[PDB]
Amino acid sequence: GYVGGLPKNVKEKLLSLKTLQSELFEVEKEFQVEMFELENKFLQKYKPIWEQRSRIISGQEQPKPEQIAKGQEIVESLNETELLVDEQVKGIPSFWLTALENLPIVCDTITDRDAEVLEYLQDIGLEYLTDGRPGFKLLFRFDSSANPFFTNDILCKTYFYQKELGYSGDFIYDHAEGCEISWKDNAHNVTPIESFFNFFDPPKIQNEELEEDLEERLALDYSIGEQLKDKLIPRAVDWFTGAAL
Amino acid sequence: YAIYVYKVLKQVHPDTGISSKAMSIMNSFVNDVFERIAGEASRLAHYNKRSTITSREIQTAVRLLLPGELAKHAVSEGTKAVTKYTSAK
């Protein structure tokens, strides 16, 4: 009310400004555009590096004594003597499994049953989306050849941002599309039970007490997404050893 | 007072968050209590016919608004704040 009933010439000024405000929206609109591309632009540079990690973990490729050499220094330079060697086994056993158990928000969601499943997790990829709605996809690559639970070769999660940018000029999470799972046995089905793999089956928009609850998990869902995106994937290595903590 | 309320929430419950609606309720609580106390202090000033509202009118306004025990602490935290405030120079 400290503006409603006041001078006119003033308000008049505001109206024009309110217009230039809109001009910013479109300018900030174009911003997020090239902004999104830049990120995806470098993701293609991260993948090759992470792919290397995948094979090194899956044992599909032996470590390069050079990488081992540089590792010796790096680890020493970071005062992480805990990972050194002075004077058998396949790829890093239970890599992402351990890395996730150290990830703040995620770790808690894993159960003793779904933990044995994540034991076959080989890698977690990332891909943005310009294929329509803004967003990204978290591809979980499991070892189908050994996974006794589900035959699925690649599980995933897709977060979508509503076309229209929010007030802040940024994106706003619209909803998430789970990549579901095809278990080969109910007894082997960890997921209804409180399981981690329910992550691929997030809550939907439509459905007191209801919204209040169906919003906390909905919020927790997006929260987890960022954890894997801005942390787990980028610093997966440290997340496994625990240095990221 | 969203942020100031969040900080306090961390001083008592570091591992506890708060929803948007819950925050809106807390904001109303603060503004509500504020107007109540200030409302009294305002009267106390007029009653005693004074043109100023010091920490004195606020204190008594707390004894009249807040219940026994609850008002007690309020008087404690308030008196302490004023004591420390004046000290810092």
Binding site: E216 | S19, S55, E77, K80
Partner: protein, 90 residues
Amino acid sequence: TRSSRAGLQFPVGRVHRLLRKGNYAERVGAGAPVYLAAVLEYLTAEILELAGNAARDNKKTRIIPRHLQLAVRNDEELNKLLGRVTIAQG
């Protein structure tokens, strides 16, 4: 911030500002905003203190209206001060 000088989390500045805009009196003391700021901080701390526990009892790491309602109604006094703020005015 005058809040630091008083060791308070709440803004001693705004409280002092609002006290002069609410037309409660011709003038406002210097210790008035500090004393009031402390009181407000306490109450909010007293609420979130119990509201948080309620959240835990219900296995929740984030406080919601439901929780705030629990802490207030379970506390004999809080279930009282809110009423004073309410004011039926009938």
